[PDB]
Amino acid sequence: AQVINTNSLSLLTQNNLNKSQSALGTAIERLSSGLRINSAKDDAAGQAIANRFTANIKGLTQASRNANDGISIAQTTEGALNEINNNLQRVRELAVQSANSTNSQSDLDSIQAEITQRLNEIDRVSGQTQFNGVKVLAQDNTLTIQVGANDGETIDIDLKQINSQTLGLDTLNVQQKYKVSDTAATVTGYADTTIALDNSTFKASATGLGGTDQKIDGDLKFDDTTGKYYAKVTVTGGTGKDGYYEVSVDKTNGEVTLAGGATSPLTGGLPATATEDVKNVQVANADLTEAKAALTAAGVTGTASVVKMSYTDNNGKTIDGGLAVKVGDDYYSATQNKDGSISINTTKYTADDGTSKTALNKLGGADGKTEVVSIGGKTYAASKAEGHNFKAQPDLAEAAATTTENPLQKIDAALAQVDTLRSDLAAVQNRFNSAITNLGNTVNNLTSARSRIEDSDYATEVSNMSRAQILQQAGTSVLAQANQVPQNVLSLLR
Template sequence: MVVQHNMQAMNANRMLNITTGAQSKSTEKLSSGYRINRAADDAAGLTISEKMRKQIRGLDQASTNAQDGVSSVQTAEGALTEVHSMLQRMNELAVQAANGTNSKESDRQAIQDEIDQLTTEIDRVAETTKFNEIYLLKGDSNGGTKNVFMKGHDAGLKGTLTDSAKTATFVMDELKAGDKVTIAGKEYSIGSKADDIKGTIVAPAQNASTTVTIDGSSYEIKDTNGNVAIYKDGSTTALTKVDVTGTGTGNATLDDLKTLVKEGSVVEADGKKYTAMTDGNNDNIDDDDSSVITKAVAEKKIQAELLAANSIGTIEGKAEVKDAATANGKTTYEIKKGYATVADTLSFNLHVGADADMTNKITVDIDTMNSANLGIKGLNVTDATGTAATYAVDAISDAIAKVSSQRSALGAVQNRLEHTIDNLDNIVENTTTAESRIRDTDMAEEMVEYSKNNILAQAGQSMLAQANQSTQGVLSLLQ
């Protein structure tokens, strides 16, 4: 029996310390709710858990970023809704101004006043619409600019317009004497000088005939084996020179017939009706009927109307229309389109991922939505005829289409962001579930462990007390 080394007590104390340590860890896990409170609890699990936490918190913020993006897009799109409304009203006003019942300039001036107010408001909306101090509709704030070329227009003329980035081409059938053409809402007849009309009176093919009407009288020109004879109003007797010119002998010739064509004569030949213009002042416009003009005058008028139609909204760069070029029965007008200089497109990225991958960025582009970019700056409908208002209708239509395109792009981005948010939230939920399995305490299981350790601790304390009492028997030997 020894007293220096109580091995039973030492053993009981060692086991009690182990139990107390385990009990302490169980208490920590139960009180914190985490299975891993320090790296020593599960080194590998801690690494995986922290990596998941990084992803979860990053995705949570990415979802918030996307929601902020939706809010900014909705702000811009809401402002453009009002711009659309104002453009629709401007379209109504332009259609009203184009009506011929507005006989006084004051009528169209009242319309112009409202158009001016609406244009100013569109510019104000573009200048002031912002989200979190970012101006959404006034373009890039870094000072960059771009030239916006206006869309090409055909001024309502009959032909084909081909539009490209900086130029446009308008092609129409070549105008010929006797043709009718509508320019700026007015119908013109292509007249000719008497000498030009004489050139349309030609001999028929051999052993054939043709009919020409001059000032209401019908003349049949008949060829018989190369000999030409002329018959008037169904007569079977050929005309003589005397019948046509008043002098000479023999049958009348084509040259004799052509002498009947004078200023003011109406001639039908080759299936067309020609009017010999009376043009005493030599301005290529009929003295008696201003709607009868030469081909050259008609082409100049067409050129002027194309210029007017393509000049709307061209603030910095003016439109130009080259002189008509005719070839192969077609007349072509080359249009150099005008432009307005506006701020560059506003572009910002929404970061919608937890990683630094550039594919996690969604770009939002918003053009400047002021009157200059929309092509309606300086819009004027106060001319006397309403033609300017007619051309303004086309310009406003282009502006409406441009706003529609921008709104459509914003709507597409919003829909994309909403899907992005749903996906991010789904990933966060599932990743959090996986991280919970690694990091969180299973409370039921840990309570069983804690209860076991609690019982062992109590038993250990009891055994330690018993072990300490075991050496008390030595005292009996001293009595």
């Protein structure tokens, strides 16, 4: 007998209902996550896009940061410029004062001194102000700021290299040259050189003394008044050949030799003046060993001379200066060393076309005493060439020579350039904000849009699921009782 199936059949619909009980399960699943490709969202692709739109907002939060960064850049750059503008504005005033014939050259030099700091600070700002590494004022560059979610939908900012060169104010000078004069400065002193002394040759010429051995004891006494060399000679066996004798020095190598061939010792022995116990040869600084050597290096043909400088101004006042190695007409800024030697001053910059080089420092410039230096084919100033790596920062301008014509005109021009650029940066701040208000406006709708699509239980929805839980709960519960009955009835056959 198979009653099992007949009843089971009836129980099978019950099971179908258990499948409906299973629906409740899927329903419970719903309440967990939300919308899925299970039965609710067939258009997975559509919603995939939605998630992606949210994702786009994710990229847009980051874009908000980016654009923000852009804005920060605008304010930082515009900020840097505010400083430059102030500086320039300061210049204008100086330019106005310069046009007053009452101001002496000196006064003009003071004005210029300020103007120089001005231009210098400017340059400092130019290649030193930055934002996250990027030197904002260092070069022209159109920063494309990504604000859209697609190619082409961007907002670009404009960066421009501002500096005394581009601004064409690098050579803004309002000085007037002085009248240079010179006086022959006969410096009095001696300096030791590296020339070694070869005392071995002495006995070779001192044979004129006789005995067994003629040798100098210790060191030779240089005489700083006649350049003569003297020495103590202990001639063994030389009746009365003991004392001091004069010795010749072969300047070319140091060989020392019996001077004048004196047979008898000097009346007095050693002249007091001969105090310099030398180990190496003394040189008459007057010959400018060093000075001339350097000049030769540079290809200077003109003979050199030591002169003291004197500058005259429009009011007959004459101010004295340092030492200067005159060559025909050119004046080099030299200095006297500790012992008396005279050495030319040098710049000591860094590279011109590779390798480290050094040039001498001449006197000149817009005033007449500015230290100018010749590097390559340009004449720079001592200061500006000082440790300036020409390989990293090539393009530079030469020293100011003449008065700038139409100062005020050029000055305004420079500022015109500044503001015209500034307006852009600023403009972008508002375009950026617009984009923010644009996207921002969309964001609110978007969140909503997708929220109306994605299924979730808050108020209107939850109610349906709550009732569903208890309802269904009674489904399984009640069906359990309704199920007990049939299973019992079956075995009533008595």
